[PDB]
Amino acid sequence: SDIQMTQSPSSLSASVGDRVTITCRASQSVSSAVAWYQQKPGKAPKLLIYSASSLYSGVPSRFSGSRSGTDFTLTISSLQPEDFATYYCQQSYSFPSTFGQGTKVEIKRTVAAPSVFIFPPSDEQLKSGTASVVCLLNNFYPREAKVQWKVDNALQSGNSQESVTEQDSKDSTYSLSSTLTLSKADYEKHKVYACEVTHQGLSSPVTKSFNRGEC
Amino acid sequence: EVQLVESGGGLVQPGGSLRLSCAASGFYISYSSIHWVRQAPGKGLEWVASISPYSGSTYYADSVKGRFTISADTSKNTAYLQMNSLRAEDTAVYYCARQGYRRRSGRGFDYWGQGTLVTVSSASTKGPSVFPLAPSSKSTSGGTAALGCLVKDYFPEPVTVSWNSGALTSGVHTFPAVLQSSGLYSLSSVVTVPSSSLGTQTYICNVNHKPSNTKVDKKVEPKSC
RNA sequence: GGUUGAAACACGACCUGAGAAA
């Protein structure tokens, strides 16, 4: 039975200057052979704390680790705009080494309403036999949002895919794209193509729509 | 400067073999423990294997024991990860990490490489079809317009999208790839620009899918209506 | 076992200990 590292919470949204605490509980004794890492999206992890409580060279002193038996905590005293990433704990007391599931720290900002855009499929794509209708939600917060596709007032389900960006580095907002995919035979049997968007930053759902060939 | 450079990744069939390399510079691997740590797309780090500096002792995660073999060539200052009997579960970005010096960093991994992407699938490579997301507004609407490109039906990851040959970087949003039901990836890359820029500014999306050796530049223009 | 030697095991040294402890 190898060692487990239960990291909690899996994610948290905090503001600049906040005091955040990430905890890791080892399923058995790992002494103090626990390390903490910081990983930016698309980049390699960076060593922050080694030996449970020792600060790695070059890491600012706002990061700190502590041990309480089998409980290990990573603490950022005052959150900085560059401290927002995913943090991992790792035990190296015995092989196999194991990492915690990670904790993504995102910046909490004020609520922002999404700017909604609808795009009809280009003339080139129906020549290929497939139609993709894209609905864009640009620069909103928080990330949670409801995107519904309605064609001739008929609700769609199971034929659209959603994709959300990471939190933007400038305005700390999210962007969402919903792509309704239909065949040319199914695309031309309908007229109205509407994208309904519901978000807490909006007083009511916003609807961007178009018709086939309506300019 | 102390650095680790992974290589040897790519697309491989399930059950096939792949040998990853980790070229080290600025230090000698013979005095350090070298570890392999992978990260499946959108998940956390998972320790894979390690090799001890002076004894050559090797250790492996339970999910890779017997299939994987880690080794080091001190004369080449390079570590290796021989991967055999590859499964779809092995699809991940593979990092090689130097375990720091004991007195200076305990057992923490003080240096990581950029990582190499390993994709285990029987799916064939396929270049993407790029379709334009034409802006609806006009050059004189007085607002901000939104345009983009639809990078559809490609395999495997990754694909890169730039606008106006990297000259346009403000307001661009390149969404993460989503795996469609057909098994091919698809994503959109959009950008918000002033409506007054239409006509004075041209907008070219540059799509580069290196695994399939496809480079496509699609011109996104206001639709002729 | 601990500490260390660029060093989790193996190896060298040191420490504890009847013994580094199969």
Author numbering:
A (entry chain L): 1 to 215
B (entry chain H): 4 to 228
Publication passage describing the model:
Here, we demonstrate that certain RNA sequences can be nonenzymatically aminoacylated and then captured by the formation of amino acid–bridged RNA stem-loops in near-quantitative yield. To accomplish this, we designed an RNA construct that consists of two loops connected by a five base-pair duplex region. One loop contains a sequence (5′-AAACA-3′) that binds to the antibody fragment Fab BL3-6 (36), and the other loop contains the aminoacylated overhang sequence (5′-UGAGAAA-3′). Close examination of the backbone and nucleobase arrangements of the first five nucleotides of the overhang sequence (5′-UGAGA-3′) revealed that both structures bear a strong resemblance to the T-loop architecture, a ubiquitous motif that frequently mediates tertiary interactions within noncoding RNAs, including the T-loop of tRNA.
To our surprise, iterative rounds of model building and refinement revealed positive density corresponding to the glycine linker between the 5′-end of the P1 stem (G1) and the 2′-OH of the penultimate residue of the 5′-UGAGAAA-3′ sequence (i.e., A21 of the crystallization construct). As a result, the 3′-terminal A22 of the overhang sequence protrudes from the structure of the closed dumbbell-shaped ligated RNA. The 5′-P to 2′-hydroxyl ligated product is a unique RNA branching reaction, mediated by glycine, which leaves the 3′-terminus available as a handle for subsequent binding events and reactions. In the crystal structure of the glycine-bridged stem-loop, the 2′-aminoacylated loop adopts an architecture that is stacked on and continues the central double-stranded region of the dumbbell-shaped RNA. The first two nucleotides of the 7-nt overhang, U16 and G17, form consecutive noncanonical base-pairing interactions with the Hoogsteen edges of downstream adenosine residues A20 and A21, continuing the P1 duplex stack and creating a stem-loop-like structure. The string of stacked purines continues below A20 and A21 with G19 and A18, but these nucleotides are not stacked in consecutive order. Rather, the backbone linking G19 and A20 is fully stretched out, leaving a pocket in between these two residues. The backbone then makes an abrupt turn at A20, reversing direction and allowing A21 to be sandwiched into this pocket. The crystal structure of the ligated product also provides a potential explanation for the increased stability of the aminoacyl ester linkage, because the folded structure restricts the solvent-accessible surface area of the ester by 90%, which would not occur in duplex or unstructured strands.
